[PDB]
Design a protein around this ligand. Structure first.
Ligand SMILES: O=C(O)[C@]1(O)C[C@H](O)[C@@H](O)[C@H]([C@H](O)[C@H](O)CO)O1
Ligand SMILES: O=C(O)[C@]1(O)C[C@H](O)[C@@H](O)[C@H]([C@H](O)[C@H](O)CO)O1
Ligand SMILES: [Mg+2]
Ligand SMILES: [Mg+2]
Ligand SMILES: [Mg+2]
Ligand SMILES: [Mg+2]
Lengths: 163, 163, 163, 162
């Protein structure tokens, strides 16, 4: 598995199943999966930062990012590739050393430029085929955790060590 | 695929899995799927208006339609066939030039009259046999996206063009 | 199918997948499936009343029974067999003309005494084996509708006649 | 195997790991009524049930109360420690505890109890620690599955309680 210095992740359709709950009062919900917090745990255990790119902008994601101690949160992003290219510049790494997981049209250009691209099994076929690794899980099922554990080559030895 | 000039759609059981969330206070929820927003994207990409016809009337659907910039919204509809005729009559459009997706008893008369009828895989057998194209997805799983993409013949080159 | 004069149904695990959403403030949610309203439609189309029996007692179910025009709503029920018995006395019918659907321990006694017992596929095996008809669907998937349509022999003819 | 105490994780056991956030700082969990049958059988056989969770919410406190769970420990940092405390207090060994958990912070405890349960949904390196097979995933009534297996609940038990 190639060398990774940064893990970037989309939210809707990755950390969730794409679900957007609306009530009558203008409030909104997302459903996260606690399993994906272990994706953060593994990244941080390995000294690798995690950044969230999303084109939505919600208090929902702000609070979830905070809860998970995510290193970067970029909301209302319209150009995901530009966002990553710039974060890479500030870190002095290149796209070949980023792992990005996304599921939709707005992710495609970034998925095509990164060192390892991941797309959940639930995503449209034309995005899915941009994946450079196989992911079994659908969004909301812990696919971000699956992506991280693959990208970082997390194995049983690592598991024994942390416990 | 025949020429389509208007895409119409039901909400519950199509944009959702039929889920209706009630609380203790009289509030109400629906769970939408961000994937279906690509249905609108593609429609608008090909210059095709989208309309929602629903028998329910909620602030939920009003706000959702607004967020997705849906072109026509009709709520509290008792006669979906009449509502589609009236909209179509305004636009100069024939029911044969309409693609409509619905999932239950109240959608049947319209489904039998449109140029392309779609029904999610989750729908009662009586309704699903009215579908004139095959849809794999269930309500809430992005079946509206699926419907639009097939109706408009969205292919890999369309995908390559928009990114 | 035998002659049925009353359809009775549990809520949790039948009309829902057994899910109970709790927030931080003491509020509560259930998720109903709009599909199950067709169960009430078909029952009423055949001149058969529907009654809810549940051990829970919530505003949630109160609203749902109202929205669906359910004929009878009994909540906080500690003994479902008795509750069904007095309602049967009150209506001048007996248990053999009742169709009941339930999914758990508190339903067991009533299920053994009704003319047609239904249990969702999702239920424990010891309850499931009391079903007197096969139900394919799980609670929350529209299994109440499946039950009513099977109990009343709803066929394509019936569908064609009501659209 | 002879059991004196059933302990259980929450998220990913009593739920599918789902955490709902709204825009206002509120939070939800989805429980399954099926799992209350877990408490029912436990109490029926005179076995107490305790909840160990690393989270801390009103959500769980209210669910535990509603289900009349015997023990509740939230914001737990070290689940092994929490369980030993309870075992010492009860005058029992971990060998007489059946525990079900689903993730890293359950591993230590899972490897020490007499019967360890892990939902089908759990990551594989946790799942392999299970000492009995559980078919069900978190949130599908897997706590009930566990109790029923651990206590050997059979049809005769069902006939008796009905
Ligand atoms: O389940 C509901 O809340 C209900 O209002 C009940 C009503 O009996 C039924 O006709 C409608 C219809 O299924 C929806 O309006 C379609 O959107 O649904
Ligand atoms: O999960 C619940 O909150 C609970 O109240 C717990 C209770 O111990 C159980 O017996 C009931 C019963 O399963 C429901 O009432 C079914 O409607 O459910
Ligand atoms: Mg996305
Ligand atoms: Mg519908
Ligand atoms: Mg029930
Ligand atoms: Mg857990």
């Amino acid at each position: 598995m190639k060398e990774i210095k940064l893990i970037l992740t989309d939210i809707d359709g990755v950390w969730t199943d794409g679900g957007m709950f609306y009530d009558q009062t203008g409030n909104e919900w997302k459903k996260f999966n606690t399993s994906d917090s272990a994706g953060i745990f593994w990244a941080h255990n390995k000294g690798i930062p995690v950044g969230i790119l999303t084109g939505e902008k919600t208090e929902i994601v702000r609070r979830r990012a905070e809860k998970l101690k995510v290193d970067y949160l970029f909301q209302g992003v319209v150009d995901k590739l530009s966002a990553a290219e710039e974060l890479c510049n500030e870190l002095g790494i290149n796209l070949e050393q980023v792992a990005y997981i996304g599921d939709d049209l707005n992710d495609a250009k970034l998925l095509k430029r990164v060192g390892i691209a991941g797309v959940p099994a639930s995503a449209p076929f034309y995005i899915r085929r941009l994946s450079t690794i196989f992911l079994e899980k659908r969004g909301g099922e812990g696919v971000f955790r699956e992506f991280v554990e693959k990208v970082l080559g997390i194995n049983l030895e690592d598991f024994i060590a942390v416990i």
